[PDB]
Amino acid sequence: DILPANYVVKDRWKVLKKIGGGGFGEIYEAMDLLTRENVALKVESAQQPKQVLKMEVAVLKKLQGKDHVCRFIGCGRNEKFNYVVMQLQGRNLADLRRSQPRGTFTLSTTLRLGKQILESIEAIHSVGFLHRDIKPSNFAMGRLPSTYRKCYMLDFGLARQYTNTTGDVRPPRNVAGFRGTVRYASVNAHKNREMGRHDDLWSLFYMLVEFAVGQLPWRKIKDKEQVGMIKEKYEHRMLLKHMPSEFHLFLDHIASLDYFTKPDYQLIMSVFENSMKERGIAENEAFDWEKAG
């Protein structure tokens, strides 16, 4: 562990426990000694080859003022480590889905989480970055009376800038090694092609099928190449058997997209809103994990 328990950062953030494992950094839960609340503290050693914290902070600062994003508290650098302090969130969508009796969410919960995730995806792309690791464990529900019904986008570690200073689209590399989670990865990412905005939309599509149907055909299969081969040949139309009919629009729209084309986020959002109108789902409705109703 980069920081032991009870260690104090910049004489303000006292380490309570480690909450996220090792890779290219560590996530800790800490106490803010000034404001008295608990915070998320992400740390990377200063003696590290691939240093991503700087990029994560750049993305988090650019996103301040948007919904579905943690509040930026602080950051710093020293001879031992680099750190970022941010607003702490609650239960992640992967643990919430697993806790469900049949491992499925109702369509009401699925469609509304869908709207919130799409808004956070549109928000990250409007600032010129691709998330590239859209998955349920990267989304968490709030932990406050003002936020318990709000879904937050987490972890900008695999993000990449796709639009330069002037808003021009950066050239794609001929080969771009894909390093995210296999399960929700698009066919383009499996092909090691440069990922675009549509690839974050493909992950949201596979997350929503998994949420409503409880499984994806390629679940439990661990070999990256094999999953990519199963996806390429799988009749995605057959993924929609039990999904609302408008998802064929979502699917036809994302299938047509390339690296350069801006997606039609409104058509995708319309697919969820009309799906909800057609079946009387309301915004005030309780989420599946909430009891007493």
> Tokens at residue 28, please?
């800790």
Q: Are 92 and 182 in contact (CB under 8 A)?
A: no
Q: Are 55 and 66 in contact (CB under 8 A)?
A: no
CA nearest 42: which of 2, 6, 7, 11? 2
Residue carrying the six token digits 């503290």? 41
CA nearest 130: which of 203, 48, 65, 182? 203
> Tokens at residue 292, please?
């007493």
Q: Are 28 and 17 in contact (CB under 8 A)?
A: yes
Classify domain 90-293 at the CATH topology level: Transferase(Phosphotransferase); domain 1 (1.10.510)
CA nearest 109: which of 285, 291, 293, 292? 285
Strand, helix or coil for residue 146: coil
Q: Give the span between the Cα atoms of 84 and 44, in whole angstroms.
A: 9
Contacts of residue 42, Cβ cutoff 8 Å, sequence gap at least 6: 20, 25, 26, 27, 28, 53, 56, 83, 84, 86
Q: Give the span between the Cα atoms of 3 and 28, in whole angstroms.
A: 9
Q: Are 44 and 36 in contact (CB under 8 A)?
A: no
- Extract the annotated binding site: 19-27, 42
Domain edges within the chain: 16-29+40-89, 90-293
The b-or-e profile of 142-153 (16+ CB within 10 A means b, else e) is beeeeeebbbbb
Residue carrying the six token digits 């949201």? 204
State the maximum Cα–Cα separation within the chain, in Å, rounded to a whole number: 58
What are the start-end ranges of the H helices in the chain?
Answer: 53-62, 93-99, 107-126, 187-190, 197-213, 224-233, 247-256, 265-278
Q: Are 218 and 184 in contact (CB under 8 A)?
A: no
Amino acid at 293: G
Same CATH fold assignment for domains 16-29+40-89 and 90-293 = no
Residue 176's alpha-carbon distances to 6, 188, 214, 222, 259, in angstroms, are 41, 10, 31, 21, 12
What Å resolution does this PDB entry report?
2.1
Q: What is the 3-state secondary structure (H, E, C) of 61-108?
A: HHCCCCCCCCCEEEEEECCCEEEEEEECCCCEHHHHHHHCCCCCCCHH
Residue carrying the six token digits 């959002």? 269
> Tokens at residue 100, please?
């469900």
- Extract the annotated binding site for ATP: 19-27, 42
Q: Are 15 and 6 in contact (CB under 8 A)?
A: yes
Amino acid at 179: R
Q: Give the span between the Cα atoms of 75 and 86, in whole angstroms.
A: 9
What are the start-end ranges of the H helices in 132-233?
Answer: 187-190, 197-213, 224-233
* Long-range own/partner contacts, residues 29-38 (CB < 8 A, 24 or more apart): 29/88, 30/85, 32/73, 32/85, 33/8, 37/88, 38/88
CA nearest 200: which of 220, 223, 181? 181
Residue range 16-29+40-89 forms a domain whose CATH class is alpha beta
> Tokens at residue 57, please?
């902070």
Q: Give the span between the Cα atoms of 186 and 172, in whole angstroms.
A: 16
- Experimental technique behind these coordinates: X-ray
Q: Give the span between the Cα atoms of 171 and 275, in whole angstroms.
A: 36
Q: How far is CA 46 from the centre of its chain?
A: 26
Active site residues: 133
